[PDB]
Amino acid sequence: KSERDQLYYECYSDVSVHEEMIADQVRTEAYRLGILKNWAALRGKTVLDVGAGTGILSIFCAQAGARRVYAVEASAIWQQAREVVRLNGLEDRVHVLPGPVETVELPERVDAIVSEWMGYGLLHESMLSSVLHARTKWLKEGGLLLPASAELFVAPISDQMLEWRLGFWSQVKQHYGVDMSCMESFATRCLMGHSEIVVQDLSGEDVLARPQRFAQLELARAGLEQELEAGVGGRFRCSCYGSAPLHGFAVWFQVTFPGGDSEKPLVLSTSPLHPATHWKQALLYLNEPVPVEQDTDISGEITLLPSPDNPRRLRILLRYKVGDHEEKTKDFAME
Amino acid sequence: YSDVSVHEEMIADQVRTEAYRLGILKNWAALRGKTVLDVGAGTGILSIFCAQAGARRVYAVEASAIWQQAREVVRLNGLEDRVHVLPGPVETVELPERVDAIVSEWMGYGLLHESMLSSVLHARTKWLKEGGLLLPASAELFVAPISDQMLEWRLGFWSQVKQHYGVDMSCMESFATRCLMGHSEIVVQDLSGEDVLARPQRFAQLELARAGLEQELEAGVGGRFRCSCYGSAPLHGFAVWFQVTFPGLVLSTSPLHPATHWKQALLYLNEPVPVEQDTDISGEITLLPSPDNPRRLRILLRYKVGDHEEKTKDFAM
Numbered sequence A: 001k002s003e004r005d006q007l008y009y010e011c012y013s014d015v016s017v018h019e020e021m022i023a024d025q026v027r028t029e030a031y032r033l034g035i036l037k038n039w040a041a042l043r044g045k046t047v048l049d050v051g052a053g054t055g056i057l058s059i060f061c062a063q064a065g066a067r068r069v070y071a072v073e074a075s076a077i078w079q080q081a082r083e084v085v086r087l088n089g090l091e092d093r094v095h096v097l098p099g100p101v102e103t104v105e106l107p108e109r110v111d112a113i114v115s116e117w118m119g120y121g122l123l124h125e126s127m128l129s130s131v132l133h134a135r136t137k138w139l140k141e142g143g144l145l146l147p148a149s150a151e152l153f154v155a156p157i158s159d160q161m162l163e164w165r166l167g168f169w170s171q172v173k174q175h176y177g178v179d180m181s182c183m184e185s186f187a188t189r190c191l192m193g194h195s196e197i198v199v200q201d202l203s204g205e206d207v208l209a210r211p212q213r214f215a216q217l218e219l220a221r222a223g224l225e226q227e228l229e230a231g232v233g234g235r236f237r238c239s240c241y242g243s244a245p246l247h248g249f250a251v252w253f254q255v256t257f258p259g260g261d262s263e264k265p266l267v268l269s270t271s272p273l274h275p276a277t278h279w280k281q282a283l284l285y286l287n288e289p290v291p292v293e294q295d296t297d298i299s300g301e302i303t304l305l306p307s308p309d310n311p312r313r314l315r316i317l318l319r320y321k322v323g324d325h326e327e328k329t330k331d332f333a334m335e
Numbered sequence B: 001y002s003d004v005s006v007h008e009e010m011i012a013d014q015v016r017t018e019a020y021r022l023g024i025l026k027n028w029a030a031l032r033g034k035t036v037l038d039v040g041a042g043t044g045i046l047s048i049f050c051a052q053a054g055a056r057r058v059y060a061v062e063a064s065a066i067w068q069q070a071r072e073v074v075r076l077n078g079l080e081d082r083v084h085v086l087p088g089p090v091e092t093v094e095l096p097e098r099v100d101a102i103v104s105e106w107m108g109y110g111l112l113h114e115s116m117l118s119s120v121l122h123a124r125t126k127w128l129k130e131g132g133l134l135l136p137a138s139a140e141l142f143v144a145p146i147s148d149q150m151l152e153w154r155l156g157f158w159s160q161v162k163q164h165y166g167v168d169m170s171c172m173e174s175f176a177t178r179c180l181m182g183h184s185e186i187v188v189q190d191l192s193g194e195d196v197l198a199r200p201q202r203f204a205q206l207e208l209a210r211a212g213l214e215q216e217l218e219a220g221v222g223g224r225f226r227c228s229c230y231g232s233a234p235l236h237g238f239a240v241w242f243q244v245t246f247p248g249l250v251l252s253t254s255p256l257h258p259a260t261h262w263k264q265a266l267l268y269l270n271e272p273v274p275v276e277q278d279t280d281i282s283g284e285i286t287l288l289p290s291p292d293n294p295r296r297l298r299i300l301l302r303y304k305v306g307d308h309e310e311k312t313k314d315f316a317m
């Protein structure tokens, strides 16, 4: 454990992870707009930014009219956040505070919490439990969470990139004159027989059926933290668009910002159908391709769990049934 | 190496694989009717090229479980009479005879990181007939001072945030510079010709036929260099790359030649150093086994930029 905590401290004390997040234009613009559109809720109010990093979101809250923002950041990057806030002339309004949000002392309960807390597959090494701790300890009753909720989606996939990698061996002879098609079964076992979650970018063309929402996390609910331990998940059914080898499933998330249209709020999506983000998607490969047809029914249950060795390490239990075949299960973990 | 991904990367490196193919096939005269040992044959592809070049026999020695797939590949291609996959380390496999030629793809990042060179040298001692053919036969090491456009972009990102999002983050630049260059790691990254700040300098050569080479690697291989800069730019450090030469044809990982999966090994100074046209840079580069692990590459860099005093930086992979 203390080895892991040291690793995360070093990672977020370093520039590259913050450069990745801020260069994620879809992510950073979504937060900027979700915050600024909530000026009515934030004007003259106080904000707690959980895991403020470089402090950019806290400054977005100040530009939306917040009177006080507490930017709490555990890693050594809090010192760069202090400099950034000072450079923008905002240190009277935005107060960068080092250390974990779980032991920070604030002058006051706050009107709003903002946080970019999401990990790969939503819950791998995420900040969610810190956000929920902060909501319990520091958010006023009736206060605002930005974003307010997260939604999880699944879809069966035919991964064009995996198809290529699997067909690679049969294509050697055409380029180099050596028949290597006998490597195909071997490559399939290596590339699909493992039980690791694969974080890879997909395109809409890989999606084999209508994507299905299978879970929703309402961050304001008390006891959501207890559900995380038992597992975040749900059941799904869909019907395939057409003929293709089924390779498994893609899991992705979106988060929703309150305010604006109460039936059309602002959404930051990591769907393969939407512009790419640094989160990509979480791929769950079957042990081998399964041939499927138009209107082939696929159903099952997907549960996101902590790993036994490490509560921060995402585990996914997949139970699934492809049309006629018998129900199968596969148990995945993030590497 | 029991897994497909490294072998797929290897064969999908088109510059590498076509250069090996041609290095072998263009040596048809020297290989016709001769015997070959393929050291670490992997999937067996190079062994089959040797058969197309007219070798009368190829022993394909492979220590990892992938030898079972190479046996299948050989059989599938109709060459089981002529290409014999032998499992296990080349140090202890027993060949029926000494061979006329050795083929091997042994090179690592920075040439010698986690490479197969030691096993090629062992096989040469034990099984190559006198003056036998080595494919490739030699490796050449090159260094060039660099101004890394990607690093510049990464360092300049923070000053661009005020435009992208209305928040000034220019103060992050010194921090990013320290993070991205203050470390002592070798960085494997592909550069382009635009990054090269002076004429590349060959600083060492390795002759694979030589009996003393294995003990020489332990002491380090390298040597001095001198160059003068093309123009004004911030010097970020040096790039180290290699080529291998087949007896007559060169497989190059230069940033000035088509990209390969080896990319180049980048050696960043602690911070950028301004340089101008004809600024003189001299120094020495040594490739060494690291103390904790002889397979891990260490590079000791000594360097003098124009008037500045001579400095040292000690990198590891």
Ligand SMILES: COC(=O)c1cc(O)c2cc(NC(=O)NCCCCCNC(=N)NC[C@H]3O[C@@H](n4cnc5c(N)ncnc54)[C@H](O)[C@@H]3O)ccc2c1
Residues within 6 Å of the ligand: A005, A008, A009, A012, A013, A050, A051, A052, A053, A054, A072, A073, A074, A075, A077, A099, A100, A101, A102, A103, A116, A117, A118, A119, A125, A126, A127, A130
């Ligand atoms: C006295 O002991 C405790 O009570 C205690 C002590 C601890 O060390 C605790 C460590 C926790 N977790 C963690 O270390 N996670 C690391 C990976 C973050 C996930 C990726 N999300 C993400 N994009 N991060 C954005 C920024 O959030 C920053 N950050 C991350 N977590 C926090 C946090 N709790 N408060 C403030 N800042 C935080 C990061 O540095 C990063 O810059 C949890 C609870 C903890 C409780």
Ligand SMILES: COC(=O)c1cc(O)c2cc(NC(=O)NCCCCCNC(=N)NC[C@H]3O[C@@H](n4cnc5c(N)ncnc54)[C@H](O)[C@@H]3O)ccc2c1
Residues within 6 Å of the ligand: B001, B039, B040, B041, B042, B061, B062, B063, B064, B066, B088, B089, B090, B091, B092, B105, B106, B107, B108, B114, B115, B116, B119
């Ligand atoms: C008395 O025992 C020893 O002293 C000894 C010495 C060794 O180096 C041993 C190495 C082993 N395996 C491995 O993975 N080592 C990782 C480093 C290779 C990085 C670069 N290699 C590369 N470009 N790939 C070509 C192919 O060469 C294959 N290979 C690699 N080395 C050999 C070898 N000695 N004979 C035959 N085949 C070999 C690989 O499997 C790969 O498929 C196992 C056992 C070994 C035992």
